[PDB]
Amino acid sequence: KSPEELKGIFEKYAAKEGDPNQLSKEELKLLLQTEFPSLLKGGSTLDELFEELDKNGDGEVSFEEFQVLVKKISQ
Numbered sequence: 706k707s708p709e710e711l712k713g714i715f716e717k718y719a720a721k722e723g724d725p726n727q728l729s730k731e732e733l734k735l736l737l738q739t740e741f742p743s744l745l746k747g748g749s750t751l752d753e754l755f756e757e758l759d760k761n762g763d764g765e766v767s768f769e770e771f772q773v774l775v776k777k778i779s780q
Contacts, residue, residue: 733755
């Protein structure tokens with residue numbers, strides 16, 4: 706794999722609502738659930754999680770901030 710794949714996957718869910726550049730809170734859920742259920746190697750409340758992830762989304766996440774997830778899958 707490569708970042709491009711993770712970008713494609715990010716885009717895959719971002720494309721549902723709120724433009725393919727952003728992951729809505731509700732969208733991240735489905736994404737993580739399909740793509741990283743085990744890889745999250747933890748779990749927490751949607752708000753807390755998406756908020757940790759939301760470096761500067763303040764409505765929706767984006768590939769930019771989602772790199773924190775990309776880091777934590779190996780965590």
